[PDB]
Amino acid sequence: MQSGIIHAAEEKDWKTAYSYFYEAFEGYDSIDSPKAITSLKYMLLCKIMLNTPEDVQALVSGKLALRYAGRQTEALKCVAQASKNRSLADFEKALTDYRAELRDDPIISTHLAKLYDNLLEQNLIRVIEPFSRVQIEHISSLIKLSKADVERKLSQMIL
Amino acid sequence: MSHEDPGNVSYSEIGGLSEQIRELREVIELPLTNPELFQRVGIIPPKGCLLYGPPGTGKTLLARAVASQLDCNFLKVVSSSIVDKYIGESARLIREMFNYARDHQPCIIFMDEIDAIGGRRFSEGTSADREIQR
Amino acid sequence: KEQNGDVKEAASILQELQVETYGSMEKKERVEFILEQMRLCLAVKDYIRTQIISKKINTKFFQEENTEKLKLKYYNLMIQLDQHEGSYLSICKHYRAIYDTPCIQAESEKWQQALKSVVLYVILAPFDNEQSDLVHRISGDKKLEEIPKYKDLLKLFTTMELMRWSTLVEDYGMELRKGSLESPATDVFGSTEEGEKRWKDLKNRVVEHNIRIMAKYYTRITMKRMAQLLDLSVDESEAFLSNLVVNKTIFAKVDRLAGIINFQRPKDPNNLLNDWSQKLNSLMSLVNKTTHLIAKEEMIHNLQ
Numbered sequence: 231m232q233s234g235i236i237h238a239a240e241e242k243d244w245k246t247a248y249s250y251f252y253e254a255f256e257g258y259d260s261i262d263s264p265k266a267i268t269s270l271k272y273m274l275l276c277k278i279m280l281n282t283p284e285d286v287q288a289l290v291s292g293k294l295a296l297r298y299a300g301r302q303t304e305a306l307k308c309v310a311q312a313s314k315n316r317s318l319a320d321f322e323k324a325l326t327d328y329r330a331e332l333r334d335d336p337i338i339s340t341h342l343a344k345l346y347d348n349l350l351e352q353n354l355i356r357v358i359e360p361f362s363r364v365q366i367e368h369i370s371s372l373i374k375l376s377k378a379d380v381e382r383k384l385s386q387m388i389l
Numbered sequence: 390m391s392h393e394d395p396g397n398v399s400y401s402e403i404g405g406l407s408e409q410i411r412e413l414r415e416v417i418e419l420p421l422t423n424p425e426l427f428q429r430v431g432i433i434p435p436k437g438c439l440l441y442g443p444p445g446t447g448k449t450l451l452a453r454a455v456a457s458q459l460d461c462n463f464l465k466v467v468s469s470s471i472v473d474k475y476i477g478e479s480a481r482l483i484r485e486m487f488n489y490a491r492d493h494q495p496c497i498i499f500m501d502e503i504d505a506i507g508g509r510r511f512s513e514g515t516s517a518d519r520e521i522q523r
Numbered sequence: 524k525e526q527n528g529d530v531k532e533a534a535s536i537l538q539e540l541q542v543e544t545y546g547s548m549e550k551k552e553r554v555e556f557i558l559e560q561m562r563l564c565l566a567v568k569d570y571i572r573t574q575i576i577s578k579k580i581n582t583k584f585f586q587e588e589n590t591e592k593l594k595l596k597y598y599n600l601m602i603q604l605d606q607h608e609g610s611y612l613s614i615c616k617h618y619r620a621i622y623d624t625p626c627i628q629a630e631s632e633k634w635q636q637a638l639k640s641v642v643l644y645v646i647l648a649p650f651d652n653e654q655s656d657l658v659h660r661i662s663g664d665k666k667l668e669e670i671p672k673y674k675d676l677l678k679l680f681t682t683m684e685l686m687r688w689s690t691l692v693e694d695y696g697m698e699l700r701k702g703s704l705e706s707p708a709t710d711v712f713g714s715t716e717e718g719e720k721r722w723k724d725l726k727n728r729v730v731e732h733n734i735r736i737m738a739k740y741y742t743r744i745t746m747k748r749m750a751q752l753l754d755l756s757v758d759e760s761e762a763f764l765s766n767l768v769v770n771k772t773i774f775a776k777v778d779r780l781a782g783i784i785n786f787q788r789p790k791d792p793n794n795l796l797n798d799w800s801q802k803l804n805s806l807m808s809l810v811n812k813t814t815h816l817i818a819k820e821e822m823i824h825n826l827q
């Protein structure tokens with residue numbers, strides 16, 4: 231478990247560390263509920279952070295996850311769904327709703343800020359796609375945010 | 390060694406080891422006649438069987454009775470006429486044996502007295518030993 | 524059956540289902556037993572297992588020929604699995620499958636409602652070539668004229684144009700509630716939760732129907748004339764084009780600071796000159812070749 235922890239601590243390999251979490255959970259399988267229950271948060275956190283969302287709902291849909299279903303895996307369900315749908319408001323909604331269940335990450339600052347800043351252009355790729363010559367106040371409306379940071383953000387995009 | 394063995398009485402002639410008589414049936418006759426059960430439990434059948442004991446226990450005789458059933462899809466080998474005078478020419482025989490046995494699907498191979506060709510190992514003895522071991 | 528089952532008592536059969544698939548499967552017993560549990564799965568409100576266990580069903584066909592009351596007649600219970608999500612095209616072939624049982628049992632009343640049933644949602648399926656041809660096969664039916672509203676439904680088929688949804692409801696408000704069979708239309712709009720979903724789906728069908736021909740016959744199109752030819756807010760038009768371009772089933776570009784938008788594609792001069800060479804080669808030299816030969820035949824037919 232703490233192999234995946236520190237191997238994911240620098241955010242360089244989000245696959246093998248996922249293998250450390252999977253291995254540690256398999257070790258905790260059917261012998262330690264409190265320790266096995268926490269592995270899912272980190273495995274699915276590393277998968278969604280890996281940008282492969284649907285296999286999260288697939289894993290929780292596995293029969294092994296049914297043994298260890300709960301409010302936390304449900305919290306990962308809505309998060310993976312909001313990430314899949316590319317919603318700046320769905321993600322904020324689940325973050326606000328399951329905040330106490332969400333605080334459990336040892337590092338919620340980088341893990342939430344990085345995924346969020348992913349979610350920005352995740353939103354922009356859909357909310358910018360259907361048009362070419364736009365006036366920016368409307369897109370600031372659809373994004374539901376100020377337009378200055380939108381200018382710097384999209385400028386970062388073309389740059 | 391294919392169209393050579395004459396007929397023989399069934400295993401009813403022999404006796405006294407019916408436990409083994411049935412026992413070979415599961416490794417040979419059953420897995421081809423009814424391969425379904427092996428799949429239902431999901432376990433691959435056995436592959437090869439060995440026979441050992443004092444001489445004249447009827448070891449050759451039992452194989453005679455077993456081959457007396459098929460009489461057409463049975464290969465027999467002395468395990469001693471395989472040697473030759475050349476360097477190769479002996480392994481190749483084994484090759485085409487397993488290739489013909491590959492040709493017909495339900496093939497039964499019999500080898501008596503492996504100890505001629507069997508051996509265990511030698512710390513660089515004679516070259517003919519190397520032909521044998523190869 | 525003693526306790527009449529429950530979630531748990533129905534869960535009891537769940538463990539011994541695939542057993543006699545390996546023990547031995549009989550075409551009149553193992554089928555009835557193997558379809559029996561999945562309805563209990565339906566009572567459990569479980570579908571992920573119901574479809575998996577059902578996958579053994581649709582490999583156990585080819586005995587409907589002797590099995591009348593059961594084989595083709597569980598499918599009615601199979602659209603309960605097909606019915607949960609929006610698989611409106613999945614049930615398309617389904618109701619044709621069940622379309623025969625009231626025809627083998629040649630009754631032509633339940634069969635009659637089978638006719639309307641199979642068709643009332645083919646429009647409700649998203650467009651595919653499988654829809655464009657299956658509408659052809661359902662077309663030309665020897666019993667299709669039994670539904671005189673099938674032609675009014677046929678107006679939605681080609682070049683759509685003025686199939687205004689207002690006139691649509693004005694022509695269709697009594698096929699929902701009124702009618703002689705009226706039951707598939709009840710499943711479409713009668714039930715509030717299902718019917719409502721199919722009101723919105725019908726809208727979906729309408730706007731999406733017209734957008735295609737718009738791309739067929741419009742170089743450019745003004746935002747206002749689009750909002751008026753769809754009878755809806757320009758914002759709503761923005762939604763309909765956005766969720767269809769992310770669908771990328773119809774490409775467009777909403778140039779919105781002027782509103783004028785196009786339905787076309789850019790042109791590589793490699794492509795343009797390629798097509799020019801195309802028309803010049805194919806339809807200039809070949810037909811030219813043919814005309815001279817018909818002209819030569821004309822001499823042989825007339826004066827030598």
Ligand SMILES: Nc1ncnc2c1ncn2[C@@H]1O[C@H](COP(=O)(O)OP(=O)(O)O)[C@@H](O)[C@H]1O
Pocket residue numbers: 402403404405443444445446447448449450451
């Ligand atoms: N139960 C038995 N019934 C009849 N004959 C037997 C029986 N057991 C042994 N024999 C005789 O003994 C011989 C067994 O020889 P074989 O099987 O070649 O043993 P080995 O290979 O040790 O020489 C057969 O030829 C057979 O006639």
